[PDB]
Amino acid sequence: FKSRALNHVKK
Amino acid sequence: LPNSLLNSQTGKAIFFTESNGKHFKEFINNFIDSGFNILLHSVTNYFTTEQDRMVTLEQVEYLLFFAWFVKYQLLRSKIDNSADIKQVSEALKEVTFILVSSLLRSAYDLKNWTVTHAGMIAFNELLNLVSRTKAAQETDIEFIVSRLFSDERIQLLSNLPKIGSKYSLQFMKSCIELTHSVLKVLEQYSDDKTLVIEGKSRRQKKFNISEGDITKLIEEENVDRDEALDILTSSLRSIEVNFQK
Amino acid sequence: RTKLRGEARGGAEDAQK
Amino acid sequence: KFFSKESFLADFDDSSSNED
Amino acid sequence: PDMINPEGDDNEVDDVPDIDEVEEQMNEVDLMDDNMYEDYAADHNRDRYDPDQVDDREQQELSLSERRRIDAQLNERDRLLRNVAYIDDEDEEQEGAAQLDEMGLPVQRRDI
Amino acid sequence: ETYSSYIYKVLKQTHPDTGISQKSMSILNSFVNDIFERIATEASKLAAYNKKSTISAREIQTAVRLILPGELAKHAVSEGTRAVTKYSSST
Amino acid sequence: NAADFSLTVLRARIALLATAIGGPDYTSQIDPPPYKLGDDCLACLKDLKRWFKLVDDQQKRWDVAMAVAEYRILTDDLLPILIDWENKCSLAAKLAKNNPDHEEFRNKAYYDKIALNCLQLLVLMTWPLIVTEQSSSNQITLYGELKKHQLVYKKTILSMESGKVLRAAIRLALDVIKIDRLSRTPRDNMVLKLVLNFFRNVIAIEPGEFTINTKKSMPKKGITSIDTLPPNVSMDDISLNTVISSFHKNKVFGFLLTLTSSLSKEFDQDFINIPLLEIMFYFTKDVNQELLFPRTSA
Amino acid sequence: TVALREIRRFQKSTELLIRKLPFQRLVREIAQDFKTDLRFQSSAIGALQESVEAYLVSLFEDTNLAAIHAKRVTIQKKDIKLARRLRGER
Amino acid sequence: TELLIRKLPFQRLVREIAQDFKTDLRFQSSAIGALQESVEAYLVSLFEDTNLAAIHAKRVTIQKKDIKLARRLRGER
Amino acid sequence: TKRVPSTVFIHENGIRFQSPLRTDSRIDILFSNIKNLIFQSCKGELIVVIHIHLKNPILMGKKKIQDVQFYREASDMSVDETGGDEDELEQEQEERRKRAALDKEFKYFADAIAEASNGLLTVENTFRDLGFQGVPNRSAVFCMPTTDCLVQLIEPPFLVINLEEVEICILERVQFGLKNFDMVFVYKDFNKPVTHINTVPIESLDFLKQWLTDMDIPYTVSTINLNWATIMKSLQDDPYQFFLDGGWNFLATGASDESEEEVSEYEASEDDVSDESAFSEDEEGSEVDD
Amino acid sequence: DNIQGITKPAIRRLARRGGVKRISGLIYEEVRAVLKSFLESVIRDSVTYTEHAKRKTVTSLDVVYALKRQGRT
Amino acid sequence: HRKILRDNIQGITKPAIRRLARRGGVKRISGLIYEEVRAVLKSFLESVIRDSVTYTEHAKRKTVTSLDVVYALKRQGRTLYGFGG
Amino acid sequence: QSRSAKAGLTFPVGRVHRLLRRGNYAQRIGSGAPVYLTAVLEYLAAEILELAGNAARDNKKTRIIPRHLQLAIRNDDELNKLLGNVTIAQG
């Protein structure tokens, strides 16, 4: 499986 | 890895309050004025033997700790003249030079890019500290600028911007600040010409030694001949670089 | 063994050879 | 600026006593 | 085709530390050379210990039980510091703790 | 050099002609102290293993027959048991 | 149906253990209910350590951590035990400083041992969660929810009467520090490493990341939120301002300063050289130095 | 022949190895880290001296064995890493 | 923890070792199982070292000389 | 390019090997050209070999080779992949039986080659029990001291040290605390360069010295590595001028030379006096348990 | 002797948990040699401990103690 | 203009490393082996002096006796003989 | 007649007993165990003395040197089994 991570620090 | 300056946005701001900000400023000031040097010396003692076994986390946190506290002492010395820059003087030893440069080189050759970014930040602040100490006093400064820019590290700092455009914004901003620091510290030697640098020789550099020459160098610089043989070998790889180049 | 050695009977021809 | 450990024990016990 | 060994020949796989092999290619120091007849025989000045710095006197020595206690303490220190996962591997840890049930869970202490 | 004079007594006992040097005697003394340390620590660990509080000669017997090579261990046991039976018969 | 049966018997056993650690002593009538230790309760602490060893470590599972987290062992059992020990020891230290050899603890060694085991569970349960490749699918499934439970842990540690557990941890450290350097066993320096590791866990806990599955195509609605927060936990509780406030109020800063300044003369530096640097990094990873100098002004 | 005579003299002048006075300065500098106010015994510095010579000579023997194993005369980074590792001293 | 080598050959190996010892002590299966588990652990350690000694020499097949290198670097004779 | 199960032809003057790939490319070696006929057993080995050393090199067409070996894979397969039954025990039975059969097969052929030469070439047998490991060239192989030669027959550098042509076998870098040493054959004639075999284990050394006593070749011990190129060139320039005065005396024999006079008496230390004593054991021997 | 009769796919499964992909022929014989030496050492240590304990049958705890000896730095 | 030798690694001189390597028995060496030997020597002295200063600091003295050093080397398993005790 | 002559060994059984007491290997030690240990020390020291003296006799040196001790350790295989890890020096 392939996953993409999203951070809250990029906001 | 935790979220840090390598991962956060350049516009991210921590909003300290008045009391919390004052307490943090007092704590960091007492940390640098009390035991930044002892802690840094102990860690560069420990990691110089554990260099080939540490995973990326300790390399990143060591380089960020070093760069952050060097930058904070630089900014405090710039703002206020009460603080002493020699409180981060143990940043300028040869062991920390070897550790930071070897971490950056091993990060580049293995194509590891987080430790490359952290070492780029640490090298930029190392050059900033060297520039501040050189501007304060005009010596060991020529020795340390010969030490950092030795080997193939000029080619390393040259080809770091060529590969910058693929990666993130923070890597590219560190490329900006590192190249600006490199050109600012190397434009100071445009007229002074003191650019003797240990270089890597490729083909045969073998020389038939003369023990009369060895003994008269023993009389000259008060040396034992084994380390004079070391000096005689190390003088053969010494080259000079052009700043226009 | 009054000599109290592991190879007291074995050392003579070793020294000879 | 050396920080003493006995001073930290004394400050710990004193701020346990009254806390200011 | 060559058969270097009956037992097996080289796999011919590429070397991952290419930087080290290249820097050995451009730098190699021979031990069997002309300079090996130079490093050994020397003056007697460097084959000395400084009498002023080094103090040689009859001093107090540890007892044997004290030295064995220090040996046990630093063996414990090296074992704690060298092989550590977390702090939870403390003293009087259960050597009979490895009790796995039929369902994989730890076996309950002390039947309901 | 606490154990050295008795090394010298053994050396006179085997034949009085030869004489021991300083450095080799120091090597011999450090050998004897090392072997003493290995017997004594190993028997202390066996006393902890069998939970006894008294050092006996029989755990010394099995400790010598532990760390020494076997053909040398049986000779060490033989001379030792002759010495300890002579000591007990003298009582 | 082996997996869900094993999960529900594991959750039942953690529930029974969490009831067996202690109670709030509703029998006594005090306006704040004082926490009372249960009968044979140190064995329950060793059972939590045994459960976290045998299942979480070798078997590559994280079911025990959430089984503890949903039954509030850190929130309701370990923190009241450590805070009660801290308050009792502070009062006893006051009364012994004014008059020595009066009003002692009855079972001080037992209280120190259960306090040390509670601190061990705090370090073992608030450890930073890293999920690299080739790990078990249980950890990959459970990572986000366990990060949220660690966020609840950090909020509860920093917010429970302004973090008296930090004072308990530094008291467990100065139990070691009062001993002379020559008389300190390596277990005592390992307890010092435990305290420094606890402070690095308190600082180092950050909100998790939002991971999505990219095998299917992204629909027209798209990502609606990337919030990874528990219900009662806000961004203010996690942030560094509360950390600095709770550390200055509980004198964590003076503790770190007095271990940093005499690192070579007083302590065995090889034990605590690395957690001290980790603590300094976990302060300074998210702080810009230009904004710390501000140069109606708001 | 005076040439093979000085070869024989060179055979007499072996076993010097690492030099005594730089080793004394280096072990003093190493001892400054653990405790600044320290003093040494000359037999202690000598014992450290030949312990380091014995360890490093055994290390070069193991590194040479690893290098000859690798179809190769020279020694590597990885040769000395293998030679140090398979003694179990990690 | 699978006991790969067959149990009755190991039980008669221990009888053979008792035969050349001429020790005439008996054996239950607990000590034999502990011996076999310890042998499996020592052999998997030796074969892992033989793996990485072989791939140090840029081969995927372990050999006679990898075994000699493992014994000599371990120092066992 | 590809090896095939070929055949070998005995003639009364020359051994013949015709390649079934190409008839024109074949090897013809005279029986008078044979210097040595070595037969090696397969015990502790994967293949079984007969080596032939020549006094006059033979050219293949582009380069002169010195010695030719005929080999046979005795085992069924060289390397076995990894990943009820009991056919394997009978399998190891059949390769021990066929190893004995192939040992007979090459021993009879060695007897045939020895008989066909009519005394000009003799037979020779190797011994594994006296063998010793070491590195010639860049290969650490179990080398093979035999009755007539010292042979090395595994690696494509094949080494045959003729014991009738060697002057001395200097043992070299033999110091204490050292597990390996360097052993160097210097031939009787000085024109060819010396042979050096490195990294021999120390435990064979005395046994190796015993072999040095069997083959009528002396030995000396030098504790330092010797630069053999300059020494051999100085021997090439003036052989008789050096040998007439101190031919072998330039090295230490084995050493003592001048006396060191560093021995000391232990100064005749007396018995220890003023002991601590004060035992106070308070322990009873009682009855010993046995 | 059954040290001749030690089965070979068991050695291949030891090799499977060893991580290797291929096994040579002399590998078998020298693994059986180091088996012989290892059993020699550990059974000698076990019979020393059970001669200390005066029992006619060895125990597994003495084998664990022999492994504590056989483990070295 | 000329580089000075101011480092603690220059106690480990290059012909000392080459003499140790010739005593060990290599035939040719690389370049990074010098500072690898320097790092190995630093690690070994830091370990042995760590045990030795622990010994002599438990002896309530400011000097190091050779008995402390030989027992420190004995604790690592690298036993030395010929120094008394 | 003290304990040393009562055991018949010139190595000191009393000093072995005392240094066993000061080591705190156990709180109780026997009487036959120091006799046994000093007989083992007698056998080992006498054997390595005899081999070292024989090695001195081999090269016709009347005086024993630590090189003869080194020859005694290297030549005997079981002494290399006993003393393989240790190196000896000052020569």
How many Å apart are CA J247 and CA H1, to the nearest integer?
10
The third-level CATH classification (topology) of the domain covering I1-77 is Histone, subunit A (1.10.20)
Rounding to the nearest 10 degrees, give the CA dihedral for residues B61, B62, B67, B72: 80
Asked whether B16 and B76 are in contact (CB, 8 A), the reply is no
> Using the beta-carbon criterion (under 8 Å), do I58 and E13 form an inter-chain contact?
yes
Shortest CA distance to H89 belongs to which of L78, L42, I50? L78
How many CB pairs below 8 Å do chains H and J form together? 52
Beta bridge partners of H76: none
What distance, in Å, lies between the first and last C-alpha atoms of chain L? 52
One-letter amino acid at J69 equals Q
Chains M and B touch (3+ CB pairs under 8 A): no
Mind spelling out the 3-state secondary structure of chain G?
Answer: CHHHHHHHHHHHHHHHHHHHHEECCCCCCCCCCCCEECCCCHHHHHHHHHHHHHCCCCCCCCHHHHHHHCCCHHHHHHHHHHHHHHHHHHHHHHHHHHCCCCCCCCCHHHHHHHHHHHHHHHHHHCCCCCCCCCCCHHHHHHHHHHHHHHHHHHHHHHHHHHCHHHHHHHHHHHHHHCCCCCCCCHHHHHHHHHHHHHHHHHHHCCCCCEEEECCCCCCCCCCCCCCCCCCCCCHHHHCHHHHHHHHHHCCHHHHHHHHHCCCCCCCCHHHHHHHHHHHHHHHHCCCCHHHHCCCCCC
How many Å apart are CA J227 and CA B15, to the nearest integer?
73
> Using the beta-carbon criterion (under 8 Å), do G262 and D3 form an inter-chain contact?
yes
Beta bridge partners of M29: F55
As given in the structure block, the two tokens for residue G156 are 């509860």
How many Å apart are CA J272 and CA J249, to the nearest integer?
50
Give the CA distances from residue B79 to residues B33, B72, B133, B202, J7, in Å, rounded to whole numbers and listed in that order: 16, 10, 15, 47, 93
Instruction: Tell me J124's DSSP state.
Output: -
Q: Residue G239 phi/psi, 5° resolution?
A: -70, 165
Beta bridge partners of J48: J72
Query: How many residues are listed for chain M in this entry?
Result: 91
Helix or strand holding residue L50 (H, E): helix L33-57
As given in the structure block, the two tokens for residue H67 are 């290098």
> Using the beta-carbon criterion (under 8 Å), do E97 and G50 form an inter-chain contact?
yes
Instruction: Tell me L9's DSSP state.
Output: G
How many Å apart are CA B38 and CA B23, to the nearest integer?
22
Chains M and C touch (3+ CB pairs under 8 A): yes
Shortest CA distance to E37 belongs to which of B206, H6, J178? H6
Domain of residue K53, CATH code: 1.10.20.10
Report how far Cα J123 is from the mean position of its chain's Cα atoms. Answer: 19
Show which subunits contact A, needing at least 3 CB pairs below 8 angstroms: B, G
Instruction: Give the method of determination.
Output: cryo-EM
How many Å apart are CA J196 and CA J170, to the nearest integer?
9
Shortest CA distance to J103 belongs to which of J48, J44, J38, J52? J48
Query: How many residues are listed for chain L in this entry?
Result: 85
- Token pair 């050492």 in the structure block, residue: K41
How many Å apart are CA B193 and CA G261, to the nearest integer?
42
How many Å apart are CA B39 and CA G263, to the nearest integer?
7
Beta bridge partners of G22: G37
Beta bridge partners of J162: J149
Give the CA distances from residue G35 to residues E79, G32, G86, G172, in Å, rounded to whole numbers and listed in that order: 38, 9, 13, 20
Shortest CA distance to G225 belongs to which of G213, G234, G212? G212
User: What crossing angle do the helices spanning K25-52 and I7-21 adopt, rounded to 10°?
Assistant: 60
CB of H80 less than 8 A from some CB of I: no
Chains A and L touch (3+ CB pairs under 8 A): no
Angle of CA points J268, J272, J275, to nearest 5°: 170
Residue J64, classed as helix, strand or coil, is strand
Of M18, M19, M37, M38, which to mutate for an interface test with F (greatest number of F Cβ within 10 Å)?
M37
Q: Residue J231 phi/psi, 5° resolution?
A: -65, -45
Rounding to the nearest 10 degrees, give the CA dihedral for residues H74, H80, H81, H86: 110
Helix or strand holding residue L57 (H, E): helix L33-57
Asked whether E78 and H49 are in contact (CB, 8 A), the reply is no
Rounding to the nearest 10 degrees, give the CA dihedral for residues G215, G218, G223, G228: -10
Query: How many residues are listed for chain D in this entry?
Result: 20
How many Å apart are CA G93 and CA G97, to the nearest integer?
6
How many Å apart are CA M69 and CA M55, to the nearest integer?
8
| Least Cα separation, residue H51 to chain M (angstroms) | 8
Residues with Cβ within 8 Å of G15's Cβ and at least 6 positions away in sequence, in order, are G71
How many Å apart are CA G81 and CA G89, to the nearest integer?
12
Beta bridge partners of K24: J79
Q: How many domains is chain L partitioned into structurally?
A: 1
CB of J79 less than 8 A from some CB of E: yes
Shortest CA distance to G173 belongs to which of G99, G71, G279? G279
DSSP M74-91: HH-HHHHHHSSS-EE---
- Token pair 């590809």 in the structure block, residue: J2
Shortest CA distance to A4 belongs to which of B2, B8, G216? G216
How many Å apart are CA K64 and CA I2, to the nearest integer?
19
Give the CA distances from residue G19 to residues B10, G68, G77, in Å, rounded to whole numbers and listed in that order: 48, 11, 9
| Least Cα separation, residue H69 to chain I (angstroms) | 7
- Token pair 């060191």 in the structure block, residue: J260
H16 CB neighbours in chain L (<8 A) are 19
Of H41, H55, H80, the CB nearest to L63: H41
Alpha helices in chain J (DSSP H): 87-116, 205-214, 228-237, 239-244
I70 CB neighbours in chain H (<8 A) are 86
Report how far Cα M42 is from the mean position of its chain's Cα atoms. Answer: 6
Other Cβ atoms less than 10 A from the Cβ of B92: the count is 18
Residues with Cβ within 8 Å of L45's Cβ and at least 6 positions away in sequence, in order, are H26, H27, H30, H48, H52
L61 — alpha (psi -120 to 50), left (phi > 0) or beta?
beta
> Using the beta-carbon criterion (under 8 Å), do G273 and B42 form an inter-chain contact?
yes
Domains of chain M in start order, with CATH, are 1-86 (1.10.20.10)
Other Cβ atoms less than 10 A from the Cβ of B35: the count is 25
Residues with Cβ within 8 Å of F86's Cβ and at least 6 positions away in sequence, in order, are M7, M8
How many Å apart are CA E6 and CA J155, to the nearest integer?
9
Give the experimental resolution in Å. 3.7
CATH number, domain H1-90: 1.10.20.10
CB of J199 less than 8 A from some CB of L: yes
Residues with Cβ within 8 Å of G73's Cβ and at least 6 positions away in sequence, in order, are G14, G18, G21, G48, G121
| Least Cα separation, residue G21 to chain B (angstroms) | 34
CB burial string B214-234: b at 16+ within 10 A, e below: beebeeeeebbbbbbbbbbee
G46 CB neighbours in chain E (<8 A) are 94
| Least Cα separation, residue B125 to chain H (angstroms) | 27
| Least Cα separation, residue D16 to chain G (angstroms) | 6
Sign of the CA dihedral with E5 first, then E7, E10, and E15 last: negative
In chain I, where the domains are located: 1-77
B200 CB neighbours in chain E (<8 A) are 23, 26-27
How many CB pairs below 8 Å do chains E and M form together? 10
Instruction: Tell me L8's DSSP state.
Output: G
G2 CB neighbours in chain E (<8 A) are 103
Largest CA distance in chain G: 75
Angle of CA points L82, L85, M3, to nearest 5°: 120
F58 CB neighbours in chain K (<8 A) are 52
CB of F50 less than 8 A from some CB of J: no
Rounding to the nearest 10 degrees, give the CA dihedral for residues G84, G88, G91, G95: 180
Shortest CA distance to I43 belongs to which of L26, L61, K38? K38
Chains E and D touch (3+ CB pairs under 8 A): no
Work out whether strand M87-88 and strand L80-81 pair parallel, antiparallel, or are unpaired.
parallel
Give the CA distances from residue G6 to residues E63, E99, G18, G56, G125, in Å, rounded to whole numbers and listed in that order: 57, 16, 18, 15, 22
Q: What is the domain range of residue K9?
A: 1-73
> CB-side exposure of I57: number of CA atoms within 13 Å?
31
Show which subunits contact L, needing at least 3 CB pairs below 8 angstroms: B, E, F, H, J, M
